[PDB]
């Protein structure tokens, strides 16, 4: 028998002690080797109540990724409310690696396997595991990248959908390549997406969203206000910071039939996603900077009000990167033996 509980977890990885890539350096000294013989356990004829919006695994992954980025990235200058330190800012190697989250002694993780689970309801076929799967800690905005795909249907996740201050996550059946590239002025880059693929996927997402909002019509709009990391799709490709204008992806007129290319830019000064302050980087490296990623999640915020109108609008971007972890951690739940 088990009860719900919260305890300190630890992490597991396949990191190399000799690598200079920054995630491997963090993961050899913060994590242990992956379970050499893992095996899951069915919990026959048992039901449990998962709730992906109050999971402490998420807070712990947040603190972990913060520590990793705090030691890992080397800006020339870091400014944090009056204080500003200046340090050597060498280039770094950077490519996220999958991380598992293991329970300590006297606890175990439960796994919701209901193919179309929405993160909050009860669960049919519950499993017991030692660790999570390999979760890649990739901070990004608007788009969720290099994650996992929904088993059967596209799934729409929120705390309530009738609250507009609470983020909504959409999990796709089918990943869509975003092929970002800076070719061999030095900051202008561009992200490319197969327009036919992406627009079919977006029509399917519209159909689901109409399913949950009373058949009502829905439309997409660019983000309304705030700093660049919200208004545009921001991410990190090999130490450089990409900012891409995503408006051509949320193109209602074309629910385009070829290649969409987003104007991306590499930025020298950024605001740290840890809420901390702003940091200055060194000019980008030379050569072809490539980044082929899977789009396997979107985050939306619904325009408040307009309960009068016969349509609902949705803009990309949802709060702070903690929820990205939810995107993968939704199906787990640590309990006390």
């Amino acid at each position, epitope marked *: 028998v088990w009860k719900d509980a919260d305890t300190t977890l630890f992490c597991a990885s396949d990191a190399k002690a000799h690598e200079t890539e920054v995630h491997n350096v963090w993961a050899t000294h913060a994590c242990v080797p992956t379970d050499p013989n893992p095996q899951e356990i069915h919990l026959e004829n048992v039901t449990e109540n998962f709730n992906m919006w109050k999971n402490n695994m998420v807070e712990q992954m947040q603190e972990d990724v913060i520590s990793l980025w705090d030691q890992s990235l080397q800006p020339c200058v870091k400014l944090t409310g009056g204080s500003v330190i200046k340090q050597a800012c060498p280039k770094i190697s950077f490519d996220p690696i999958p991380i598992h989250y293991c329970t300590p002694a006297g606890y175990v993780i439960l796994k919701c396997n209901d193919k179309n689970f929405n993160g909050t309801g009860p669960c049919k076929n519950v499993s017991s595991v030692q660790c999570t799967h390999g979760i890649k800690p990739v901070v990004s905005t608007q788009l969720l990248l290099n994650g996992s795909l929904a088993e059967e249907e596209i799934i729409i996740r929120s705390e*309530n959908l009738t609250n507009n201050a609470k983020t909504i996550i959409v999990h796709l059946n089918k990943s869509v390549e975003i092929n970002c590239t800076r070719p061999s002025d030095i900051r202008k880059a561009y992200c490319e997406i197969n327009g036919t693929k992406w627009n079919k996927v977006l029509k399917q997402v519209t159909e689901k969203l109409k399913e949950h909002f009373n058949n009502k019509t829905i439309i997409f709009q660019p983000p309304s206000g705030g700093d660049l990391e919200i208004t545009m799709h921001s991410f990190n490709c090999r130490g450089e910071f990409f900012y891409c204008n995503t408006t051509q992806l949320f193109n209602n007129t074309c629910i385009c039939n070829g290649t969409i290319t987003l104007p991306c830019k590499i930025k020298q000064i950024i605001n740290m996603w840890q809420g901390t302050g702003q940091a200055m980087y060194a000019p980008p490296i030379d050569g072809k900077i490539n980044c082929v990623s899977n789009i396997t999640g979107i985050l939306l915020t619904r325009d408040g009000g307009a309960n009068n109108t016969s349509n609902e609008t949705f803009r990309p971007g949802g709060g702070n990167i903690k929820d990205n972890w939810r995107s993968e951690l939704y199906k787990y739940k640590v309990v006390q033996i």
Partner: antibody
Framework: ADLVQSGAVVKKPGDSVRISCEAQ????????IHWIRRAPGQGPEWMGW????????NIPWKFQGRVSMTRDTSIETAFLDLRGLKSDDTAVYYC?????????????????????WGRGTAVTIQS | ALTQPRSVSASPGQSVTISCTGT???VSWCQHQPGRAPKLLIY???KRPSGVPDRFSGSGSGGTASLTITGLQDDDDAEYFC?????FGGGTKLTVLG
């Protein structure tokens, strides 16, 4: 712990107004901030919420373009901006702190949790 | 957006009930003394925070929500407002009849 609002003012039609909200006694970066409106002879009217971490805003159609909710985490102050004032904009505006939403340990409220309230700033449109 | 009557009144010791009609979402309540900063009283129908007395309470189901203040005092004379997300009540002036 309170939200200090700026003093009352008068304006002319058209025109535009800026109002502050200096947060005190808590972590301004966490918990979003709603701006609400009370006009003479009408019930309270919400104008939008603003996440002070990144500055993201959620604003209903009635006020698109005409309003902007900004902030300056350096001195923990929110800001409301209204352009092109008419008569129906004459009102008292409050900044208010939600605490069931944002980053940080939220309060646990399924509805909106309007914890902390400013004292109000009156703008009068003297046409 | 949400109805709410305009006036309540009672005398230093009895009990009153303000209500908010509208639609079936959860409602929180707020007291607003003349010109002061409003104060959260009770949230999510019946739940009550801390710093606020047991006399204030509430509930709700069927379309309308109720907020009750028992054992009134000469400092409860203020306006009261309710909300369900961004649907707002018009307000209710509470008069303590002297």
């Amino acid at each position: 712990a309170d939200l200090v609002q700026s003093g009352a003012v008068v304006k002319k039609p058209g025109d535009s107004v800026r109002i502050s909200c200096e947060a005190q006694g808590y972590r301004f970066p966490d918990y979003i901030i709603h701006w609400i409106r009370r006009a003479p002879g009408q019930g309270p009217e919400w104008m939008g919420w603003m996440n002070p971490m990144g500055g993201q805003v959620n604003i209903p159609w009635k006020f698109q373009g005409r309003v902007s909710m900004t902030r300056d985490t350096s001195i923990e102050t929110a800001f409301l901006d209204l352009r092109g004032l008419k008569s129906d904009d004459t009102a008292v505006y409050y900044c208010v702190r939600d605490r069931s939403n944002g980053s940080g340990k939220r309060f646990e409220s399924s509805n909106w949790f309007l914890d902390l309230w400013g004292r109000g700033t009156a703008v009068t449109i003297q046409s | 957006a949400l109805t709410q009557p305009r006036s309540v009144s009672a005398s230093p010791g009895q009990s009153v009930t303000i209500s908010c009609t509208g639609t079936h979402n959860l409602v929180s309540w707020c007291q607003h003394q003349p010109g002061r900063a409003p104060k959260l009283l009770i949230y999510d129908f019946n739940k009550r925070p801390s710093g606020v007395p047991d006399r204030f309470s509430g509930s709700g189901s069927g379309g309308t929500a109720s907020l009750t203040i028992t054992g009134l005092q000469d400092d409860d004379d203020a306006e009261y407002f309710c909300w369900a997300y961004e649907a707002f009540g018009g307000g209710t002036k509470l008069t303590v009849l002297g």
